[PDB]
Design an enzyme around this catalytic site. Structure first.
Site, PDB file in Angstrom:
ATOM      1  N   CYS B   1     -27.098 -38.455  84.601  1.00 54.17           N
ATOM      2  CA  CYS B   1     -28.230 -39.285  84.256  1.00 54.17           C
ATOM      3  C   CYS B   1     -29.652 -38.628  84.211  1.00 54.17           C
ATOM      4  CB  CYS B   1     -28.102 -40.281  85.149  1.00 54.17           C
ATOM      5  SG  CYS B   1     -29.601 -41.377  85.294  1.00 54.17           S
ATOM      6  N   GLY B   2     -30.362 -38.843  83.163  1.00 53.52           N
ATOM      7  CA  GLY B   2     -31.762 -38.456  83.087  1.00 53.52           C
ATOM      8  C   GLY B   2     -31.964 -38.044  81.647  1.00 53.52           C
ATOM      9  N   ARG B  31     -26.369 -35.094  88.923  1.00 53.93           N
ATOM     10  CA  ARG B  31     -26.692 -36.378  89.212  1.00 53.93           C
ATOM     11  C   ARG B  31     -25.727 -37.334  88.629  1.00 53.93           C
ATOM     12  NH1 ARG B  31     -31.803 -37.771  89.887  1.00 53.93           N
ATOM     13  NH2 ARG B  31     -31.833 -39.729  88.703  1.00 53.93           N
TER      14      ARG B  31
END
Ligand code: FMN
Ligand code: F3S
Lengths: 1468, 81
Positions: B1-2, B31
């Site tokens: 996620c990012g 993440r």
């Protein structure tokens, strides 16, 4: 695979009907495809009535009070992976049901048991729910059903509006319910336990077990549908969908009302043919018609001009044909309304159906006969369903109607003689009208404008007018494809004709001309849901082709109501003359048809020195697709006049595009011009034009039957062609639904080519047409593949064993400009080269090539033995051909040259099949179609068959032999699986390989034949040779082998099956580079083919079909055979040089073995000619590579496939003393329809132990109790006797050789002997010698292709003794239609009782007379005496006791060939 | 996620931008959710400019003459079964 239906005649519901239905569904697994997993199935389904009591108890225990009227239940499949979509679907169906006033009672979750589902099915299993609706409005049942139908259609439309996936309403009504799924047939009652309650009672039950053509399932595709249960497939599905989109615009009926406007898209998307048929069926039923009427309207009977059908039936059939086009194809329909239950057949009656009447007022019908258990003392009468017949049950009144009773019931509703009386046939209109022109300069100019040759024109145009037969070629084509040419090529050189291989069979034309019609109609379209004498007022033509005087007659009949549109464009225009020309003609025809003209005429008489004529194909295509997409086609008809049309393929492609009547005005002018110069002899113009029209009609009928269509009205606009060499955009816009896997020239290329042709035509004063080089080689242009220098260099290199000369040869071959697709493929590796000794040896590569089979009737026995010896010596596998082989070659000679064949072929004629012949082999072969002619089979002229061939095939000398096109034992993939079962049974060592033909859509058939236990697929190209075949089928049929090979490879590795079978190609293989490319594409074995032939004495003279080959390979004379110069060492040297060149290439690539290259596509690249400017052929659809997975791309398990065991094993395990002492033996067993091919293995044993005629008749005998299975006693060698008490299924006695089969009804049964069907269809297909004594009737095509067998049957069916060649067939009772069609040799007897035989028999080549000589009388007497001694039949005894009186009733049927060859004088 | 992005301030294309993008995507494994199968993921993506030289070389090898102005590339997901 199989359908079935049980029904109660009185009409009282009960539980025994569902009980029998489930007992039947438990006994179908022996037909459908088995899976190695055990939990996965193809699809099953049942259809019963609604158990009112059960749902009433349900809504009671829920809390509501039950109503008194009926209660509707609806079953739905909702999505499962999500939950919010389920809520959307629920609210949709609820807000659509409540919009009418019905009060919802509630839902119900169907309790299931998922554990018995396989893996591929549980991945896509949707949620199953039921809804309960009550009729609180107090309305009649019919409005209730109609309202529920409207609700279902509206719900489907609405949910399609939101693009939700996997939502299917199975059935929503108050009369019946449907339980269908993807489980097996044996676990149904354990999947839906609801069916085990004693409350599910009904009065009728239908069930279906489908067969898959792939591995992936889809629940909404499961049978049965809401009103139908179809078995088989449908050929003409595209044409019918197009005509339904045409009829959609003007169909109305007051029964629906406003909601009618809602039901416009009557045929959805994504459904199979059966689904479309079912939805149109339901639409036509809901309007008010009963079930038999719509069944007769959708698939009518063949209207023959015979005295068998009464006159009212004929008027009814004419009306049915006029109101709506048929749906041809193999169909065994079992449909049900809320009141009727109908079971019927298609037009030709391919797939069978058999029924039974009990004493309990119960009727049970299906595909096989031994499905449900019934004691023999309760049966009343057994029967069958022939071509077009049907059987009906009326549940309201509760009665049973057979064929003729139902037909008479239907022929008494409306005055059918007063309606069709208002039509006219444009024959007398022409007779009274005609009774009331161009010089050679313009003729030659306008012929040159289209690029017609002069010799190659008179090469094919003269044989039509001279005799009335199309030209006959002699060798496979090698000309380049249309787009790869450089000269002018009309559009008709691009469209390739379709055909059917395995799924459905072709239709024979020279023997079944009574079921195929050609009538065309002008003025029948209109409202289909109406019924009045106004619809049937039209013009009826006898053929879609039109001459000049007839065209003018039709025109000045129509007069002013028609319109005329020019089909030319200005040459002085810019680069967009064709585009705006098409735009203009489309706008003009749209405006004209809007204005009121009901007849559009296309013509190109306006061609001159400044205007160029548009090719008619594109013009009519654009106009027709425009009228379809503008809702206008049902208003008018489309007429064309061409100045190019010369051959049958042109008219075929022009009609398939969607025209109605094609007119050729320049061909008749040229014929008259050649006539007035005196070239025909003494024939007037009338006989010439008659012969020409006859030849054209016969060619069109052949093109139609090539794919299995019987009516032309269902072929118009269907577009059954593939465009190879056209841009996808053009063929998608200006043409109906057709495929073009690779792109091609668009509007620019065609415009440039036609402009250049017109410039060459009208700028120069022409004197004579060019000699032309399309068929035969010339020096003008159109370079071929085989040239003189090439053949000479190859012969030199092979007769001198010089590798340098062979390399020079290969370089000369692969130097020419691109002529095939494989030329455009340049192969490039990436790694480093490898020394040449490091690749695998030469023998391991020579053992990979094979020599394809070539019929012994085609080439001399000398060359055949030469090929055999060569392939045996080199260590590879040879082939036999369709001509069988001579027994004298079944022993190794003294020099060590085994003259045998390593692969035997099973053609469509069974011209040499024998028990002694099927075991002296290594791997068997099934021929579905050859590369040259897809739907014709090998043709042999009349004089080529000497006495040697006549003794090989038991045929009569000096008689033209043409093999029947369709495999009479392959009407669907199921029958092919059964035949593979028999072939693997008879030979416990050999494999079985199927031979296919490359075309579009071969992927599904490849998946099927992979599932059907086959081992080696043989994809053949379009450039394969032939022995004798027409030119039309050679020039414009098939596709290159590369396309089909890559397609099969991809589709076969996608379903996870490639690792189970081997792929082998052939067709146009000359060098080693092509071998390497074929190995890269996915092949594993290779067939060299015709190269060997030219290295053996063939010099491309192309006269094999005349018995005068100069060198003498294809000849059956003494003199020409003596000039044979072929040597067995030449072929060995050729194969060695091929292997060495492959080694060189492979060592240059940088690889070590072919097993490291199979299935690789990262080694090829596409290169094309940019200066040629043609639209680049995007070959990426071919080079696309599927992911391999874990199994290797080429891997293949060792040993053949596995097959379940039949009863035969348990017989030989008991008859052990026989194989050690040879003792007489007698055994007894119980036979169920699960068992198949009883006795084939024991026949193989007795063959390997004693041969064929080693044992005396009746040495080992078997008795069976019950109902045997398919192919009872196939290939029974003399010495086996089989006696069954009960009934036989079908295919009984197939390939019989010396044995003896006896069928007799059990002594307990009270049936009458000669009023019941006891054996199925295609009995004795291809027998050789032996006896068969039955007691009962027979099925269709009884004793087809028989030569030497003796059979005695009480009754017969349609098309009996078709193409019989030898033996004796005694028939007692009524005969079918078209009896003795195509009979060549033998003799038949028929016991007629009312002199009705002349109205049935076909009198082409046979004659029917009376018995006068005492010899034949005594022979028939002895035959019937032995028959009554065998089966203890009382009817035969009643005949025998009255011999003196009943001898005169017998008719004797004798061919017109044994009039002078018989030893006994047949005539006084 | 990012998410993440890399841009050249001056505006000259180079290999370093794409290389740093790949390097950044190589280090976001902690993440996102961890699967015990070691194979499945949630779905990732990268977005760059069209390398005209590569496609011009491709079409040249095919046989056509590379046009002098900009080309265009369209990526499609079609059915497979
Ligand atoms: C003279 C001749 C006779 C043939 N006879 C048969 C035949 O009887 N049965 C068959 O399946 N194929 C027959 N074939 C086709 C070959 O078996 C093979 O499929 C084909 O020739 C391969 O294509 P090619 O022309 O490039 O060699 C024949 C071919 C020729 C040239
Ligand atoms: S063209 Fe045919 S007739 Fe013989 S010489 Fe060659 S195989």
């Amino acid at each position: 695979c199989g359908v079935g239906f049980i029904a109660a005649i009185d009409g009282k519901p009960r539980r025994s009907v569902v009980e029998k239905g489930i007992e039947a569904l438990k006994a179908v697994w022996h037909r459908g495809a088995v899976d190695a997993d055990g939990k996965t199935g193809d699809g099953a389904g049942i259809h019963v009535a609604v158990p009112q009591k059960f749902f009433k108890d349900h809504v009671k225990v829920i809390g509501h009070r039950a109503p008194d009227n009926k209660l509707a239940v609806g079953q739905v499949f909702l999505p499962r992976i999500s939950l919010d979509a389920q809520e959307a679907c629920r609210c949709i169906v609820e807000t659509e049901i409540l919009a009418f006033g019905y009060y919802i009672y509630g839902w119900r979750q169907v309790p299931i048991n998922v554990d018995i589902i396989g893996e591929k099915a549980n991945a896509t299993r949707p949620e199953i729910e039921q809804i309960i609706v009550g009729n609180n409005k107090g309305v009649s049942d019919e409005q209730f059903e109609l309202d529920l139908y409207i609700i279902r259609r509206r719900i489907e439309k609405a949910v399609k509006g939101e693009q939700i996936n996997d939502f299917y309403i199975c059935s929503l009504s108050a009369r019946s319910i449907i339980y269908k799924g993807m489980f097996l047939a044996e676990q149904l009652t354990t999947f839906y336990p609801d069916l085990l309650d004693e409350r599910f009672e009904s009065d009728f039950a239908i069930y279906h077990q489908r067969y898959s053509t792939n591995t992936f399932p889809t629940w909404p595709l499961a049978q049965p549908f809401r009103m139908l249960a179809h078995n088989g497939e449908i050929n003409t599905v595209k044409g019918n969908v197009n005509w339904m989109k045409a009829h959609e615009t003007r169909m109305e009926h007051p029964a629906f009302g406003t909601h009618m406007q809602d039901l416009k898209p009557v045929i959805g998307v994504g459904l199979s043919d059966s689904g479309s048929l079912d939805t149109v069926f339901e639409v036509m039923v809901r309007a008010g018609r009963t079930a038999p009427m719509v069944k007769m309207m959708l698939v009518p009977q063949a209207l023959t001009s015979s005295q068998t059908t009464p006159d009212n039936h004929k008027a009814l059939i004419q009306y049915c044909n006029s109101v709506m086009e048929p749906w041809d194809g193999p169909a065994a329909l079992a449909m049900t309304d809320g009141r009727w239950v109908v079971g019927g057949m298609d037009r030709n009656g391919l797939r069978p159906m058999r029924y039974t009447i009990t004493t309990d007022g119960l009727i049970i019908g299906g595909s096989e006969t031994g499905m449900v258990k019934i004691d023999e003392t309760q049966v009343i009468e057994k029967g069958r369903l022939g071509p077009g017949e049907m059987i009906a049950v009326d549940l309201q009144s509760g009665k049973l109607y057979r064929d003729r009773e139902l037909k008479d019931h239907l022929a008494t509703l409306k005055p059918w003689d007063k309606w069709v009386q208002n039509t006219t046939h444009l024959d007398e209109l022409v007779k009274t009208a005609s009774l009331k022109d161009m010089d050679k300069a313009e003729l030659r100019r306008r012929q040159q404008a289209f690029g017609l040759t002069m010799e190659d024109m008179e090469l094919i145009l003269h044989p039509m007018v001279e005799d009335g037969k199309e030209a006959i070629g002699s060798m496979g084509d090698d000309s380049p494809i249309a787009v790869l040419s450089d000269k002018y090529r009309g559009l008709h050189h691009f469209f390739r004709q379709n055909f059917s291989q395995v799924t459905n069979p072709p239709i024979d034309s020279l023997r079944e001309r009574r079921v195929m019609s050609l009538k065309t109609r002008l003025g029948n379209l209109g409202n289909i849901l109406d019924e009045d004498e106004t619809q049937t007022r039209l013009l009826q033509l006898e053929s879609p082709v039109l001459t000049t005087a007839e065209f003018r007659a039709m025109r000045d009949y129509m007069g002013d109501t028609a319109a005329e549109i020019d089909a030319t464009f200005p040459v002085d225009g810019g680069p967009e003359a064709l585009r705006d020309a098409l735009r203009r003609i489309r706008q003009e025809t749209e405006d004209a048809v809007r204005g009121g003209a009901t007849h559009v005429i296309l013509t190109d008489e306006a061609m001159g020195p400044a205007r160029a004529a548009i090719p008619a194909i594109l013009a009519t295509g654009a106009v027709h697709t425009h009228l379809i997409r503008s809702n206008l086609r049902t208003f008018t008809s489309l007429n064309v006049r061409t100045a190019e049309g010369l051959d049958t393929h042109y008219f075929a492609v022009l009609i398939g595009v969607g025209a109605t009547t094609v007119n050729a005005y320049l061909a008749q002018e040229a014929i008259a011009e050649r006539h007035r110069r005196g070239l025909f002899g003494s024939m007037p113009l009338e006989k010439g034009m008659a012969n020409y029209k006859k030849a054209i009609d016969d060619g069109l009928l052949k093109i139609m039957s090539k794919m299995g269509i019987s009516v032309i009205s269902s072929y118009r606009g269907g577009g059954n062609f593939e465009a190879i060499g056209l841009s996808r955009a053009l063929v998608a816009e200006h043409f109906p639904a057709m495929v073009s896997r690779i792109s091609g020239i668009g509007l620019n290329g065609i415009q440039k080519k036609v402009l250049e042709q017109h410039a060459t035509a009208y700028n120069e004063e022409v004197v004579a047409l060019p000699v032309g080089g399309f068929y035969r080689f010339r020096k003008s242009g159109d370079r071929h593949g085989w040239e003189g220098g090439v053949i000479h260099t190859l012969q030199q290199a092979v007769t001198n064993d010089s590798y340098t000369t062979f390399k020079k040869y290969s370089e000369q071959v692969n130097k020419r400009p691109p002529m095939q697709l494989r030329d455009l493929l340049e192969l490039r590796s990436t790694k480093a080269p490898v020394p040449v000794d490091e690749v695998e040896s030469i023998t391991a590569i020579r053992k990979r090539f094979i020599t394809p089979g070539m019929s012994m009737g085609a080439l001399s026995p000398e060359a055949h033995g030469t090929l055999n010896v060569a392939m045996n010596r080199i260590g590879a596998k040879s082939d036999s051909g369709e001509g069988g082989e001579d027994p004298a070659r079944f022993r190794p000679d003294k020099n060590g040259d085994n003259w045998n064949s390593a692969i035997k072929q099973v053609a469509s004629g069974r011209f040499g099949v024998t028990a002694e012949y099927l075991n002296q082999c290594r791997e068997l072969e099934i021929k579905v179609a050859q590369g040259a002619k897809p739907g014709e089979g090998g043709q042999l002229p009349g004089f080529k068959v000497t006495e040697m061939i006549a003794r090989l095939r038991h045929s009569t000398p000096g008689v033209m032999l043409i093999s029947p096109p369709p495999h009479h034992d392959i009407y669907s993939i199921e029958d092919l699986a059964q035949l593979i079962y028999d072939l693997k049974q008879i030979n416990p060592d050999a494999k079985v390989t199927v031979k296919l033909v490359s075309r579009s859509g071969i992927g599904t058939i490849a998946a099927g034949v992979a599932k059907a236990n086959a081992d080696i697929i043989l994809i053949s190209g379009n450039s394969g040779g032939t022995g004798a075949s027409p030119q039309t089928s050679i020039k414009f049929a098939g596709l290159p082998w590369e396309m089909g090979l890559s397609e099969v490879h991809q589709v076969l590795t996608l379903n996870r099956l490639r690792h189970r079978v081997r792929l082998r190609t052939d067709g146009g293989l000359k060098t080693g580079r092509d071998i390497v490319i074929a190995a890269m594409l996915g092949a594993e074995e290779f067939g060299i083919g015709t190269a060997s032939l030219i290295a053996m004495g063939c010099i491309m003279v192309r006269q094999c079909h005349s018995n005068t080959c100069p060198v003498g390979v294809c000849v059956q004379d003494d003199k020409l055979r003596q000039k044979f110069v072929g040597t067995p060492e030449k072929v060995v040297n050729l194969f060695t040089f091929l292997a060495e060149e492959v080694r060189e290439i492979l060592a240059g690539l940088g690889f070590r073995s072919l097993n490291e290259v199979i299935g690789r596509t990262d080694l090829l690249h596409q290169v094309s000619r940019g200066a040629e400017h043609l639209d680049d052929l995007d070959l990426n659809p071919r080079l696309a590579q599927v992911d391999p997975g874990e199994n290797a791309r080429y891997c293949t398990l060792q040993g053949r496939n596995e097959v379940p065991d039949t009863l035969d094993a348990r017989i030989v395990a008991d008859a052990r003393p026989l194989f050690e002492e040879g003792e007489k033996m007698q055994l007894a067993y119980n036979a169920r329809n699960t068992q198949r091919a009883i006795g084939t293995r024991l026949s193989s044993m007795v063959t390997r132990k004693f041969g064929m005629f080693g044992l005396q008749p009746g040495h080992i005998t078997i008795r069976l109790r019950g109902t045997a299975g398919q192919s009872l006693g196939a290939f029974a060698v003399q010495g086996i006797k089989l006696e069954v008490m009960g009934d036989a299924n079908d295919y009984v006695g197939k390939g019989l050789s010396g044995g003896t089969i006896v069928v007799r009804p059990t002594t307990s049964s009270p049936l009458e002997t000669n009023k019941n069907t006891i054996i199925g269809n295609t009995v004795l297909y291809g027998a050789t010698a032996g006896k068969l004594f039955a007691a009962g009737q027979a099925g269709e095509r009884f004793a087809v292709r028989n030569s030497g067998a003796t059979v005695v049957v009480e009754g017969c069916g349609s098309n009996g003794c078709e193409y019989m060649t030898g033996g004796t067939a005694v028939i007692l009772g009524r005969v079918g239609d078209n009896f003795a069609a195509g009979m060549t040799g033998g003799m038949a007897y028929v016991y007629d009782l009312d002199d009705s035989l002349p109205l049935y028999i076909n009198d082409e080549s046979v004659i029917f007379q009376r018995i006068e000589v005492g010899h034949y009388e005594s022979q028939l007497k002895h035959l019937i005496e032995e028959h009554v001694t065998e089966t203890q039949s009382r009817f035969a005894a009643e005949i025998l006791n009255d011999w003196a009186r009943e001898v005169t009733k017998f008719w004797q049927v004798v061919p017109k060939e044994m009039l002078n060859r018989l030893e006994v004088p047949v005539h006084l």
